[PDB]
Amino acid sequence: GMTEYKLVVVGACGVGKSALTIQLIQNHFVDEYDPTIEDSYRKQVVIDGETCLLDILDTAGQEEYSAMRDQYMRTGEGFLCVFAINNTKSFEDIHHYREQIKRVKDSEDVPMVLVGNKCDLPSRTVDTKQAQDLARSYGIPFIETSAKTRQGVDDAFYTLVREIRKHKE
Ligand SMILES: *CCC(=O)N1CCN(c2ncnc3cc(-c4ccccc4F)c(Cl)cc23)CC1
Ligand SMILES: Nc1nc2c(ncn2[C@@H]2O[C@H](COP(=O)(O)OP(=O)(O)O)[C@@H](O)[C@H]2O)c(=O)[nH]1
Ligand SMILES: [Mg+2]
């Protein structure tokens, strides 16, 4: 039976949670995506030779009950924590997101990956070393991505699957 990995993409508004998710799934870059739209996507991929199904929730601004969000929080196995490299505040927000994840799973050891998105942009205010230092502190990988050019998009989600596989075994 095909293994499924339940992934949840989190981070502050505008960092590119949706654009990352839509790029991985539909192979195009979206200029606007309703920041209030929270949806789940599936895709069949092969990762290190294992055919498997990514089940991804793109979190958003939800003042309303989502039965589907409840299930991904309860049963999600890995988190993509996204900030944007031209948004210092979104980088400062990461710690908040990591603490929420630990609380949701009631553990210090939750599979997650730090993603620095929008690295196609020149106006960079969060440098790579800051992000590596934070990732090293958390004990998690750090990947630089561009939802616009596709740089690191497969790598970020695939690295997350690999962290989940290690968590299992
Ligand atoms: C621009 C709209 C958008 O993308 N968002 C608005 C809501 N966000 C938000 N703000 C603060 N705190 C959180 C915390 C969570 C969260 C809860 C539990 C576990 C993991 C986790 F990330 C989420 Cl999903 C969104 C938050 C950002 C998204
Ligand atoms: N240049 C550039 N723009 C991006 C990138 N990712 C997202 N954006 C833009 O940033 C805005 C916010 O993206 P969105 O995915 O809605 O952020 P979200 O609220 O976290 O899901 C959108 O207009 C995207 O077109 C990127 O990697 N590079
Ligand atoms: Mg969005």
**What is the residue extent of each domain of the chain?**
1-169
Cβ of 18 closer than 6 Å to ligand 2, yes or no, is yes
Nearest residue to 163 (alpha-carbon basis) of 130, 141, 143: 141
Structure tokens at 102: 């630990």
CA distance 127 to 104: 29
Distance 15 CA to ligand 1 centre (A): 12
CA nearest to 142, candidates 80, 99, 96? 80
Compute, in angstroms, the gap from residue 57 CA to the centroid of ligand 2. 16
Those residues with Cβ within 8 angstroms of residue 112's Cβ, 6 or more apart along the chain or in another chain: 78, 79, 80, 81, 98, 101, 138, 140, 160, 163
> What gap in Å lies between CA 53 and CA 33, rounded to an integer?
24
Q: Is 83 in the pocket of ligand 1 (CB under 6 A)?
A: no
Fold designation for 1-169:
Rossmann fold (3.40.50)
Q: At what angle do helices 17-26 and 153-168 cross, to 10 degrees?
A: 90
Question: What are the beta bridge partners of residue 149?
Answer: none
Q: Are 55 and 4 in contact (CB under 8 A)?
A: yes
Burial of 139 (0-12, 13-18, 19+ CB in 10 A): exposed
Measure the CA–CA gap between 115 and 84, rounded to whole angstroms.
Answer: 8
Regarding the beta carbon of 10 and ligand 1, being less than 6 Å apart is answered yes
